[PDB]
Amino acid sequence: ATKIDKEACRAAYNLVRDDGSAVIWVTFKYDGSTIVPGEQGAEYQHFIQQCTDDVRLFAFVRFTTGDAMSKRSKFALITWIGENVSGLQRAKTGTDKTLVKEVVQNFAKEFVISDRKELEEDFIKSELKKAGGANY
């Protein structure tokens, strides 16, 4: 019976999109059975710390790559699933992403990760490089 606070998760989503905002990541978490905004920041390293072993969550992160005239904004939708989270949870969570993709309309790529080493900034960017264009 998972649902989501669209009206609220959309504000966060838009906050990471808007360039002049400084916010580069917003999390979406389970607040019972209703998915809602978690934390957000300007520092990517602070996001990795939201991804503990007993939590599962969703994220929308703006990655900047290249430089000068080659600068491009790579958005990524991420589903962090704690290694120490239930078994039904992991699968039930993969179900709810559908519900999350209703607000989080476009992203160059999506991830289902449970090993922080995968959130390593330069590795995740490498991965966004091998991807391509948005997702409507």
From Swiss-Prot:
Tissue: Widely expressed with highest levels in placenta, lung, kidney and peripheral blood leukocytes and lower levels in brain, liver and pancreas.
Coiled coil: none
Record-listed N-acetylalanine modification sites: 1
Pfam families: Cofilin_ADF
Outcome of swapping residue 129 to A: No effect on 5LO-binding activity
Keyword ATP-binding in record: no
Any GO BP: regulation of actin filament polymerization
Protein name per the record: Coactosin-like protein
UniProt source species: Homo sapiens (Human)
Gene (name only): COTL1
